[PDB]
Design a protein around this ligand. Structure first.
Ligand code: NA
Lengths: 120, 117
């Protein structure tokens, strides 16, 4: 019935930019928000914020204000997360969720690596 | 000011078929004037997305079995699992959605104890 599908893993060098997608299917996209969650190694789950898919208005946690951007392509039922000027500490798996409905994407693992960024 | 969510321990031990409790505290009451209490429990197993177990503090999500339950008042919350099975191993997290930003507790790893042959 319902599926959130995220873009594949990313391996990056410090200072680069990444943009992750989350495509929603099987419900009316604009009826429900999209939340972004950061899952660390050694820092559990962090709520990054959410975006109103009907109005486009984003709400960010303070810790994610600056380098992080939530956006939409509503005709494609797609929400995007862009992370600028990557830091080692951005290494994580990022999830999209429609949290009220408990729909979850599969996660996108982001690895920021000074010396292994070339393996993919 | 952010609501801080705290879990009492980073892991708790249990043996198969026995019951366990996992605790969470908030710095502010999560009861809203509308009568709902804005507390979720999730489980995340390695390799999986988080999945919701409980919403509105005590209500089981669909598909979640009867051996899970939640209780609490205001700022103290407890999830119980009554007859633990292997599949229950994972990290359990509380989250508040009363006020922005939504906040998670630090998580509690459920660790199923077994003897070394
Ligand atoms: Na606040």
């Amino acid at each position: 019935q319902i599926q959130l599908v995220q873009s594949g893993p990313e391996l990056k060098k410090p200072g680069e930019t990444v943009k992750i997608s989350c495509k929603a299917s099987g419900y009316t996209f604009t009826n429900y928000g999209m939340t972004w969650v950061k899952q660390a190694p050694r820092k559990g789950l962090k709520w990054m914020g959410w975006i109103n898919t009907y109005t486009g208005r984003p709400t960010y946690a303070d810790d994610f204000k600056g380098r992080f951007a939530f956006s939409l392509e509503t005709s494609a039922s797609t929400a995007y997360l862009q992370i600028n000027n990557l830091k080692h500490e951005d290494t994580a798996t990022y999830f999209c969720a429609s949290l009220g409905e408990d729909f979850w994407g599969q996660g996108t693992t982001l690895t920021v690596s000074s010396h292994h960024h070339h393996h993919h | 000011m952010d609501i801080v969510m705290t879990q009492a321990a980073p892991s708790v031990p249990v043996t198969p078929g026995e019951s366990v409790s996992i605790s969470c505290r908030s710095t502010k009451s999560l009861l809203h004037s509308n009568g709902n209490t804005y507390l979720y429990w999730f489980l995340q197993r390695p390799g999986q997305s988080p999945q919701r177990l409980i919403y509105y503090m005590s209500n089981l999500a669909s598909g979640v079995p009867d051996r899970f339950s939640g209780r609490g008042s205001g700022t103290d919350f407890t999830l119980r699992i009554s007859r633990v099975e292997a599949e229950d191993a994972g990290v359990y997290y509380c989250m508040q959605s009363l006020e922005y930003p939504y906040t998670f507790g630090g998580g509690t790893k459920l660790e199923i104890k077994r003897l070394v042959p």
